[PDB]
Amino acid sequence: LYEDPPDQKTSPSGKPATLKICSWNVDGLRAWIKKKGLDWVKEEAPDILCLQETKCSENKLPAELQELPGLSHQYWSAPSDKEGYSGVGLLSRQCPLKVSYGIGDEEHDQEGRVIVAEFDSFVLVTAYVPNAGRGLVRLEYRQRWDEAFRKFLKGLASRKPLVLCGDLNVAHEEIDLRNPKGNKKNAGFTPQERQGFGELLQAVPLADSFRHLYPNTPYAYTFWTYMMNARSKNVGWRLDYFLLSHSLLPALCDSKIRSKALGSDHCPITLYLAL
Template identity: 25%
Template structure:
């Protein structure tokens, strides 16, 4: 099973850059997009509904602001819109999940908190609530893949020139600690790092110029413990760029999509 995740910096711009032509050649089973910056009614053109896929969108209700999408070759049993946090901060980002018999795949756009201090408070609350949810669902007999732009890097090898970025949102001490807890205490894993353990692989460039300087790896496919031994291959697509982020591609050893439907 091939899963692709990409934060597009606006779906119209990405489409103009050839995203959907590229998607047609990937033979992916699930494609998760983030940061659409479009409302669902604006996406009724055929280009945004690739042949052979069911398409699902969750916009922000505000034009030109966030939004996520999932394309799937198999019709899910259920859809979940949002994370349902009692604090309400999940709506500061966006989350959409498709459920199959034993698998759930989510597309996540986390708050970035690049603005004033109050934004950082929202981001902290978001990930505190998310951690509580992840801890709760570890007891379920279900496999999870959380794809998306987490707006957060884990270790120094995930940030180019990390020393000058330690005071930047996305690589603050408490954010690194949160990811340590996610992977070391809650039992989740970074699918890309399982297949590509070396440093020097980045998925996002804050300058918008891909590959130029100060790359970050903030785009992740986080998987539950039952999928750790299922990761076969992972890569970032670098030949052509569709946004300031690179597509994250992971192949899982799930034959014939066992248990998906």
């Protein structure tokens, strides 16, 4: 049983939130639209909306999307017929200084997984990290991914404060999933993936915004398998994060998990900063 606390919209020093970022693995744009994903997003009214697993291989974006109120600057993984392609999206009220795609490493840049948007005061990265796979078939690949990604982000953070959000496909600690003992050998909770996530936090460095604010809170999940009504039982995993440069912690007001928002097998997460 989990109840997200009310939105806290001031920083530790009392500054009003000035930026609201929403991130959501949508499990396919079209299916998500059908399930009222966009109605929810219009209620949330974020300054920036980051979407993962759009499954938008085809050139044509749905019309509902370009028309989304306020969020007129929209960046999508380039459409691709490549097998294994996932697609991410980054939509913004303000025009970014600069937008980039991928992580400068060809092995990891074929599947539309990463968008970088630079603003004046910080850089925003959204990512859909590769799942380690059924029977751990993509585990060795995931370890090469974690290292390249860590290095790429360490590079960005050296220029400007960093915000990374998205589906990072790992539950960090035992408190991060309902069933830690049964999943030691499943994608998302292997020691390798937990270790990669620990090295990410250290090397960049980055802080886990939710767990920073709520260090003891259990049953706070962000994903539930469609299988066997896991969501009804809250049999879930926290795979979605906002990770912040330490220098942004004094700007951090709250980090939310939108437990009841329907539309996908993940729920949205939301970040408030005072910048």
